[PDB]
Symmetry: C2
Subunit: 325 residues, 2 copies
C-alpha cells in the first residue's frame, strides 16, 4: 500500500555500503572504507509544532527535510558523516497521500546529507491520535575518525565566531509562531512578505549544512560548531564554550531576515526572547582561529552558503556565557 | 604592482596542503593524505572569443570563472580532484583595475572547485596587445587514486547517459556569437530575453561541476564523463566512447535554454552546427549502468544540479559515433 509508493524514493537514496533494508526489522550497512578507527555518532529528534503548522497550511511536502536536518546537523558538529536514516511515523488513521509526502520529504533530506533511508515504521494507534494528526521521529547514524572528532577542547580566548545563515525559522519556536498568528489574526497565505506569502517563509524547510561543513572541516582548523535549535543562541552556544570563556556576538554584523522582523513586530517580542526562541537568521555558529577566518568565509560563500563573521570568544569568568552587543 | 590588490584573494583560496607564503617563484603543495597511490592529472586552457565579448560590455569580474571551469571541469572527467591553479595574464599596458577583476573571478572559481590559486604571471607585451586587450591562460593539477581512474573502457552496451545542465553558452562558440550579434545588428544589453538582457544570458559564467561529480563518483558506479567544450556533442562525446559503441541522444528529454533558441533564429543556424558550436544546455554527459541511474539522478538533482536521462549507448560499428534524434 504505502510501501508501494515509497519503494522508489527510498531506493534512489541507497549508498554503496548498504546491504539491506525494509525487509524485516534490521537494516544492513557496512562502514565506509576510508575510516581506520570509526566511531559512531548518533542522535534523534522530531519536527515539533511545525508539524501542526504544516497540517494547517495543508502542506506536508517539506516537513521531512526539517526532520532529517535536525538530526544530521547535530552529527556534523563533531565531524561525523551521516551514514543512514530511519523514521518512526505514528498516526491514528493512516492517510497515504500525507505519509507519502512526508517520506518524500525525508528522502530529499537524506539525498542532501549523503546518508540513506534504510528503514522505518508506520504505527497506527487510533486511540492516542485524533484526526489526521501524526508524529515523526528521526534517527541518524554517522561515522567519524576517532582522532578527528571535534570535541571543542581547542576552543580558546581569541577565537572568532563565524555564522551560517538560515533558510528561516527552521524547526524550532513554532509554538510562538502559531501563538503570534493567533493573536495577530493573520492568515499566513494571504499576507505577503518580499513578494511571497508569509506561509512560505514560515514553512520554509530547514537548511542542511552537511556537505559545506564536511568540506570546511577538512580545509580549515575548526575548533567547534554549534547548531542553533531549541533555546537559540542562549542554549546552543555555551554547549561549545570551554570554562572561563564568553561568546560576544556582534548584532550589527547581519540583517534579520524579514520573517523574524514580522514575528517580532506582530508578537511584540523582546530582544532576549527572539534570540531564545528563533534562530534570527543564524542556523550554525562556527569557532576557529583568527588566521583561518578568511579561508573559511570564502569557502562557504563560494559554495552556496551565507557566511559572515558574527563575533568572537573572549576569556572571561562571567556567568552570562553569551552577550549580544 | 597589483600583487597587493590580489594578495588577499589568493591567500584566501589556500588549502592545508599549500606550504609557504607569497608564492613568488615556486609554489609548494603537498599531496592530500587520502591518496594511497596518487596520480597527477593536468590541463591547460583559455577563455576564448568570449574575452572579446567581455571587453565590449566592460565585464571582466566573471571571465575568470570561465577560465578555471574549463580546466577544472576537464580534470574531474577522469575522477581527478583539483589541487592547485596558476594563470598567465598577458597584456600590453597593465590596467591594475581590469587585472584584479579577472583574478577575482579566478579566485571565485578556485573556491567553487576546491583548489588553491598558488601562482601567476603578468607579462606586459608592448607591441602585441592593442588597447585594454589581455589574454589569460589557465593551469590546473588534479589528483586521482590510481585504482579509481575513469578512462571509459567500462562503457558497455545498454549504458545510460546522464546530462548536467549548463549555465548557458559557457566558454566556447563565441566567435559565432559575435558574428550573429554583428550580422543581426543586435545590442546584447538593450535586447530583452525572458526577463534579463541578452548579454546576461551570454556572459553567464561557466558552471563548475567539480563538487557534484566528485560526490557522484563516490556513491555511484560511473563509466565515463564528457565535458562539452569546443566541438560540442560531436567532438566531446566520442572522446569517452570505446570501439563498437554509439551514443544515441534523445532530443525530447530537454529543451534548449532560450539563449540558444535566440542564437539559432538570429543566425539561421542549422541543427548540426548548433550541436557542434554550442552546448545547447548540456555542460556534461555521464555514462553509467541503468541500475545506477535512479540514485545518480536523485543525488545530482538533490545537490544543485539539473540532471536528466539524455540518451543511451548501444553496440554499433557505425562511423557516426553520436546520433541526435
Amino acid at each position: 500500500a504505502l510501501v508501494g509508493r515509497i519503494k522508489g524514493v527510498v531506493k534512489k537514496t541507497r549508498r554503496p555500503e548498504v546491504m539491506g533494508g525494509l525487509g524485516g526489522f534490521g537494516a544492513l550497512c557496512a562502514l565506509p572504507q576510508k575510516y581506520r578507527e570509526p566511531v559512531l555518532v548518533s542522535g534523534t529528534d522530531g519536527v515539533g509544532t511545525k508539524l501542526r503548522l504544516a497540517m494547517d497550511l495543508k502542506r506536508h511536502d517539506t516537513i521531512g527535510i526539517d526532520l532529517v536536518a535536525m538530526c544530521v546537523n547535530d552529527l556534523v558538529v563533531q565531524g561525523a558523516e551521516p551514514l543512514f536514516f530511519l523514521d518512526y511515523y505514528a498516526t491514528g488513521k493512516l492517510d497515504v497521500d500525507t505519509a507519502s509526502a512526508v517520506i518524500s520529504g525525508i528522502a530529499e533530506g537524506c539525498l542532501q546529507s549523503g546518508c540513506s533511508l534504510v528503514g522505518g515504521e508506520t504505527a497506527e494507534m487510533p486511540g492516542m491520535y485524533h484526526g489526521e494528526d501524526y508524529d515523526v521521529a528521526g534517527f541518524c547514524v554517522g561515522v567519524v575518525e576517532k582522532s578527528e572528532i571535534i570535541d571543542g577542547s581547542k576552543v580558546s580566548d581569541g577565537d572568532v565566531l563565524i555564522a551560517l545563515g538560515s533558510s528561516g525559522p527552521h524547526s524550532n519556536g513554532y509554538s510562538l509562531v502559531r501563538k503570534i498568528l493567533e493573536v495577530s489574526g493573520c492568515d499566513p497565505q494571504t499576507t505577503e512578505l518580499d513578494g511571497k506569502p508569509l506561509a512560505d517563509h514560515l514553512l520554509a524547510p530547514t537548511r542542511i549544512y552537511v556537505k559545506s561543513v564536511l568540506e570546511l572541516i577538512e580545509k580549515v582548523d575548526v575548533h567547534a560548531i554549534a547548531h542553533l535549535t531549541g533555546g537559540g543562541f542562549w542554549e546552543n552556544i555555551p554547549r561549545v564554550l570551554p570554562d572561563n570563556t564568553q561568546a560576544v556576538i556582534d548584532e550589527s554584523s547581519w540583517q534579520w531576515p524579514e520573517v523574524f522582523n514580522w514575528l517580532q513586530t506582530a508578537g511584540n517580542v523582546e530582544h532576549h526572547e527572539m534570540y531564545r526562541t528563533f534562530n534570527c537568521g543564524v542556523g550554525m555558529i562556527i569557532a576557529l582561529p583568527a588566521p583561518e577566518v578568511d579561508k573559511a568565509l570564502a569557502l562557504l560563500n563560494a559554495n552556496g552558503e551565507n557566511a559572515w563573521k558574527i563575533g568572537i570568544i573572549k576569556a572571561s569568568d562571567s556567568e552570562q556565557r553569551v552577550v549580544i552587543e
